[PDB]
Structures are given as C-alpha cells and as structure tokens.
C-alpha cells in the first residue's frame, strides 16, 4: 500500500465531471475543478487543466496525470509549509502518508488548523491526537474516510485499508 493506492481508495475514479459531497465540480481521482456553481466554468477549468476540449470527459490516463500532479503538489506544499514540514519530518512513512492524504483533501490551510492534534502528533501521542482530530467538521462530514485516515495516523499501519 502507498499513498497513491490509499488516496485512490479514498477519492475513487470518475471520468465525467461530477459534484463532490460538498457539491463542487470535480473530476478524476478527487480533482476539484471549481467552487463555482457554473458547470460552464467547470468545463473551462477542465479544458485548461487537460489542454484540450474535453467536453467534460477525460480518459483514465488524463485522470492519472492530474492525480500524479496533485499528489506531487500535496507533498511539495507540506514541505514548504513551516507549520507542517516539521511534523512531517518527524513522522514515519505510513504516518507521512496519512498527513499527505489530509492535505490533498483539505489543503495546507485546513490542515494547518489541526494544530492541537498535530502537536500531539509531533509528540507521538497517538491516542490523544486521534481523539482530538475526531472533533472536527472534517470527521463529522466524512466520518468513514476520516476514520481510516485517523487510524493510519495513529497506528502507523495500513490496517484500515485492508
């Protein structure tokens, strides 16, 4: 199991523009197109992303390309975030994956806000931090995913993903 496999399980794969749980236009493997209501806006954003006239549909290949990019940007964002980088570096590899997952899903920003947990996470207080992260809109909104991610973070194993 690795980060790609993990997020691929958590975000799925859709070839046609769809709305996420939040109702935002998205495509591929969790590739948010836009926050705007405009499906037109969304095709435009899509076209620009792919470099062609998609007409709201991409191939698998295209989807995996956005995904590679998105994973990559997620990692690089972490590493340029001053709050984040140090937690990251302190982590073992499974746990690092958990952090990247959250960052991909919520942004450096949304993640920036788990300060209380993350501190505990920097401290190796697996249980404490896990319980605190649970007190989050994040968890209440996508409890099953949230659960898998928090378990991975806490245990440092992929059990949740088997």
**Residues annotated as binding site for substrate?**
32, 104, 117, 132
Q: Which does 46 bind (CB under 5 to 8 A by kind): Cl ion, ligand KR, none?
A: none
Query: Which residues between 38 and 67 bind Cl ion (CB under 5 A)?
Result: 49
Which residue in the list 11, 45, 62, 70 is annotated as catalytic?
Answer: 11
Stretch that binds ligand KR, among 27-35, 38-46, 48-56, 112-120 (CB under 6 A): 112-120
Stretch that binds ligand KR, among 2-10, 57-65, 124-132, 139-147 (CB under 6 A): 124-132
Which 3-state string (H, E, C) describes the chain? CCHHHHHHHHHCCEEEEEECCCCCEEEECCEEEECCCCHHHHHHHHHHHHCCCCCCECCHHHHHHHHHHHHHHHHHHHHCCCCHHHHHHHCCHHHHHHHHHHHHHHHHHHHHCCHHHHHHHHCCCHHHHHHHHCCCHHHHHCHHHHHHHHHHHHHCCCHHHC
Binding mask 4-23 for ligand KR (x = CB under 6 A): --------------------
117 forms part of the interface with ligand KR (CB under 6 A): yes
Cβ of residue 70: shortest distance to Cl ion, in angstroms? Answer: 8
130 forms part of the interface with ligand KR (CB under 6 A): yes
The question of whether 11 is a catalytic residue gets the answer yes
Radius of gyration of the chain (CA): 16
Contact of 77 with 103, CB cutoff 8 Å: yes
Binding site, by residue number, is: 32, 104, 117, 132
What residue ranges bind Cl ion (CB under 5 A)?
Answer: 49, 142, 144-145
Residues classed as catalytic: 11, 20
């Amino acid at each position: 199991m690795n980060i790609f496999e993990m997020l691929r399980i958590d975000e799925g794969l859709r070839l046609k523009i769809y709305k996420d749980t939040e109702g935002y236009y998205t495509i591929g493997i969790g590739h948010l197109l836009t926050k705007s209501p405009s499906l037109n806006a969304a095709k435009s954003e899509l076209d620009k992303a792919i470099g062609r006239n998609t007409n709201g549909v991409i191939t698998k290949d295209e989807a995996e390309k956005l995904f590679n990019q998105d994973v990559d940007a997620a990692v690089r964002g972490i590493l340029r975030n001053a709050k984040l980088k140090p937690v990251y570096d302190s982590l073992d590899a499974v746990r690092r994956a958990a952090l990247i997952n959250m960052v991909f899903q919520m942004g450096e920003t949304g993640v920036a806000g788990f300060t209380n947990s993350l501190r505990m996470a920097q401290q190796k207080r697996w249980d404490e931090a896990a319980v605190n992260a649970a007190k989050s809109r994040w968890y209440n909104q996508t409890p099953n995913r949230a659960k898998r991610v928090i378990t991975t973070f806490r245990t440092g194993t992929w059990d949740a993903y088997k």
